[PDB]
Design a protein around this ligand. Structure first.
Ligand SMILES: Cc1cccc(CN2CCC(CNC(=O)CCCOc3cc(=O)n(C)c4ccccc34)CC2)c1
Length: 127
């Protein structure tokens, strides 16, 4: 019956960079998954109150979504590509932990994770 604070997308005392690899994570990886027919459940934080999922955040202590990831990239929040790659991996893992194999939401996540993997495979070497 209440959502937590969302993940921070802004922290002025966190040091930041805008690397070639971070630019690809935006213009290639996030863009690819964002436009997908299965992106919609992943485009903002889990609204456990409207979804009637009052255990979600009992179970899920590290929430992540592509709304967050997107703001983080657009805001220049990260130091490196690995922090961002972690965030996508977290989002996928959380889906798997909470739900049961073969639920529509897990197949959605599986499809996006496949594209994620195809895109990251070609992550450029730093400039
Ligand atoms: C009593 C009540 C209170 C509030 C709302 C409702 C109406 N409705 C009844 C139960 C219904 C449950 N529906 C589901 O689709 C839950 C399945 C798991 O869903 C997700 C699981 C998940 O991991 N993620 C990321 C999602 C992201 C977006 C949308 C859904 C999920 C949604 C709310 C009834």
């Amino acid at each position: 019956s209440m959502n937590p604070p969302p993940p921070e997308t802004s922290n002025p005392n966190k040091p930041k960079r805008q690397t070639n690899q971070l630019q690809y994570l935006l213009r290639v990886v996030l863009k690819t998954l964002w436009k997908h027919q299965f992106a919609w459940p992943f485009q903002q934080p889990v609204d456990a109150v409207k979804l009637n999922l009052p255990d979600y955040y009992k179970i899920i202590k590290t929430p992540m979504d592509m709304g967050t990831i997107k703001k983080r990239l657009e805001n220049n929040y990260y130091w490196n590509a690995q922090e961002c790659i972690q965030d996508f991996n977290t989002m996928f893992t959380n889906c798997y932990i909470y739900n049961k194999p073969g639920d529509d939401i897990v197949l959605m996540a599986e499809a996006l994770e496949k594209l994620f993997l195809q895109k990251i495979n070609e992550l450029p070497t730093e400039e």
